[PDB]
């Protein structure tokens, strides 16, 4: 009937109370984290805001980088479980999630219930990464974040071979030496990252709804290039800070249930 | 009896006349390629020092860029078959061919008869070639070529995680930040390209005799790391020029035979 959940980084702390599994009855945040007040000065506001004794709370789950450090608590679940577990919550029905990292690119298969089923990670190659934008547009001297609106008025397209991250390095400045367009230019690389996560997606399987995640899903141009290439709708939902804690209030409710 | 084969690049013409596919008879090298006097020139002088006549050549193959271009030949072989069959020539019992080019690298198996018989390239990846290896030199400001000999002298082995390029490419300034030992250094670049290749290798197949060619191959310090790590002796010959033309006397040999 009430659970909480804790999220516990290096630098922040978050926590969340969840009646009956439906609804946020408290948040809040501190930018303090793992070995100092933070975690303690966010109790406090939970139980001051809400009037609740211990006794109340019938499970506490906790994740995040300091998890393991904090006792007074019923499980530790990962933040990868749990982060993606909150944002079903967020968007009901999701069951594909895809983050785009700065250095990684991982899709996620979830339940029913938003719960994590299987995942793809890649790690290892620059290419269909964070990455691999910052590199292109150190090229052509532009920013990283003014990036996604320049592509907007494409006419033609730059089409490229290179998949490798270096290689490519080279075919922009043979298509910048020719002076094409730069929406053009900036189309097609959106196109190389997009192709590159599309075949995770592809091992992995569709199944809406599908929401993108991360840093990178806010280039407005590699979510279009992304949804032609994948052919399916994708949403980009604006996800708040206590999203992990969410989900763990969440772990943190499939176990008090299970109880009884 | 008595063969030819020729070989016709874009910025040169090559040929080799070859008595019983045992004897070099006679060979030439004209500065001059495909659509040039350049072939003409070769034949007076191949012509011209043995003087033998037209009859007397039983069978004549031709191989190259321009090997399309050019009619009075009994047959086009491709240049990857025919230099292979030419190195072999030089290192008899040769059964594994390791090329590490610019932008690439192929193993290939060969023949009881030094015969191609499948091969593995890697032209997608800039890791576990040529330019991985421009790329790191940049960084720590050195000459390519300088690169194998500073690498005899290590003591240590700085050891990497990073198998892409890109990534790679800072994990080098970390390690140069803290100011390690170059010969440290070069040695654990030197053993990423080897693990690189060395699973193509692995692929494949290894068996003896094992040549290394190419460009790189004359980097002491590769050619060791990629010994180490297939766990065979390698030979780094010297191969010349006409080496493609004499694959080439050596196909139009096989078929002279088969005529009887
Ligand atoms: S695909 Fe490996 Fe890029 S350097
Ligand atoms: S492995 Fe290097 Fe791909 S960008």
Redesign the pocket.
């Known amino acids: 009937m009430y659970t909480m959940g804790l999220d516990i980084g290096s630098t922040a702390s978050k926590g969340v109370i969840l009646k009956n599994g439906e609804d946020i009855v408290a948040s809040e945040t501190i930018s303090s984290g793992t070995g100092t007040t933070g975690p303690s000065r966010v109790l406090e506001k939970l139980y001051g805001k809400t009037g609740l004794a211990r006794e109340d709370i019938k499970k506490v789950v906790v994740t995040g980088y300091g998890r393991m450090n904090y006792s007074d608590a019923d499980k530790q679940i990962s933040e990868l479980s749990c982060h993606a577990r909150g944002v079903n919550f967020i968007i009901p029905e999701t069951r594909t999630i895809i983050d785009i990292g700065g250095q990684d690119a991982k899709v996620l298969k979830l339940d029913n219930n938003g719960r994590l089923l299987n995942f793809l990670m890649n790690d290892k190659?620059?290419?269909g990464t964070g990455r691999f934008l910052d590199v292109m547009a150190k090229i052509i001297e532009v920013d990283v974040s003014e990036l996604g609106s320049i592509s907007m008025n494409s006419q033609n397209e730059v089409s490229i071979s290179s998949?490798?991250?270096?290689?490519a390095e080279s075919e922009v400045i043979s298509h910048l030496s020719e002076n094409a367009k730069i929406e053009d230019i900036v189309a097609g690389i959106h196109t190389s990252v997009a192709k590159r996560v599309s075949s995770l997606v592809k091992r992995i399987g569709v199944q809406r709804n599908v929401v993108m995640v991360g840093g990178v899903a806010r280039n407005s141009g590699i979510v279009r290039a992304m949804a032609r290439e994948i052919n399916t709708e994708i949403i980009v939902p604006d996800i708040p800070q206590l999203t992990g804690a969410l989900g763990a209030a969440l772990y943190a409710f499939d176990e008090a249930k299970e109880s009884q």
């Not at 998949?163 to 290689?167: D, E, L, M, S």
């Open positions: 190659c620059a290419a998949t490798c991250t270096v290689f």
